[PDB]
């Protein structure tokens, strides 16, 4: 794979660029992120980020598996008194009768709402960060961004599988990721407070510390072990970002 990508790059046969790429001053940015992420993928052999290789190089693996960092029903950890009657009508009065059709339930079960794949909505309107399952917004959002860029790489090198894995149907499945990374880096600039290129360097450090760690689930079978994998990857990613007070002057000086 390394030599084949090198050959495709020397003679301008890169699958990402097909004479129709992003035309702003950010196709280069997403290209450097893509090259660095792909290098982390092919150099690394640890099973912690093996799901990343499975997502990128073998899109059929995640053609059915739960794509991570996605809107998930909170009715899985466990009381506000919203109980649906057997006929399908919710009730909230605390053997009563339902407010509709007066079903003999009340008083005087798998709730699976989580979906699979790229359930995220249109990236154009997204200004709120979602902190869930005990993940600080920093590491959550960074994992979100790396997932987006890995999916962009996979769709570029293998189109149809990722076109079929996304629930929002679009006529340019590779097209909207440019503004996806637009809004992602915009909210990175807002939340981190650094400059745009400074945030790019911070993301570079975040994605490099995955490569410089060569010391659970491989295909992310279900939601709970996927959350567990988020848990075990956040504890590794975090300390480098905690030590950003000293690495920032270092990177500035370099």
């Amino acid at each position: 794979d390394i030599s084949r990508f090198a050959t495709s790059l020397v003679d301008n046969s890169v699958p990402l660029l097909r004479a129709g790429p992003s035309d702003s001053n950010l196709d280069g940015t997403v290209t450097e992120m893509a090259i660095h992420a792909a290098a982390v993928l092919l150099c690394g052999q640890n099973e912690l980020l093996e799901p990343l290789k499975n997502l990128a190089f073998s899109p059929a693996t995640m053609a059915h598996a739960f794509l991570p960092t996605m809107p998930e029903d909170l009715l899985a950890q466990a009381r506000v008194h919203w109980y649906t009657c057997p006929n399908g009508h919710p009730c909230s009065v605390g053997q009563s009768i339902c407010i509709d059709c007066h079903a003999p339930i009340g008083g005087i079960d798998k709730a699976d709402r989580t979906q699979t794949g790229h359930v995220l909505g249109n990236p154009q309107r997204r200004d709120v960060v979602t902190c869930d399952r005990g993940l600080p917004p920093v590491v959550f959002l960074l994992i979100r961004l790396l997932t987006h860029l890995a999916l962009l790489l996979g769709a570029s090198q293998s189109s149809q599988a990722l076109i079929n894995i996304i629930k929002p149907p679009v006529r340019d499945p590779k097209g909207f990721l440019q503004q996806h990374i637009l809004k992602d880096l915009e909210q990175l600039a807002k939340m981190l407070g650094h400059s745009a290129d400074e945030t790019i360097g911070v993301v570079h450090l975040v994605l490099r510390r995955l490569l410089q760690e060569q010391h659970f689930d491989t295909e992310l079978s279900t939601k709970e072990m996927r959350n567990n994998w988020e848990k075990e990857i956040a504890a590794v990613i975090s300390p480098e970002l905690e030590h950003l007070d000293k690495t920032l002057p270092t990177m500035n000086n370099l």
Partner: protein, 144 residues
Amino acid sequence: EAELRLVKFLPEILALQRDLVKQFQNVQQVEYSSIRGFLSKHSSDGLRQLLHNRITVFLSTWNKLRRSLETNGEINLPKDYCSTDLDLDTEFEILLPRRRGLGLCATALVSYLIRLHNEIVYAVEKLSKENNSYSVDAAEVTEL
């Protein structure tokens, strides 16, 4: 805080529900599925303007939260309802807070807003240790 700042719009939409439940003397069916057509057939232009402001507020607070409502609600809303950005030309059944059907959207939103408010108030209930059961019901709800 991004979705908690929308609790301030809770009373207005609540009035929009009440000023419909009282106003709608049951004709046994919903008319043509268009809010704009409903305003067109509405008699007085002043109440037309008032209802227009109310529907615009409701649609604005619904579109920004429908993606959230798709997973953060406590009632199983079918995935097609929380899929498109509804506008003033959508089905009129949305405004009526029916417990089953399209109206189950609107009610759900209201529920979330309640669960958006009391929950953070719940945190205060975990701080002072003395509970003031000032639990107003969803018809006296005001700016207070």
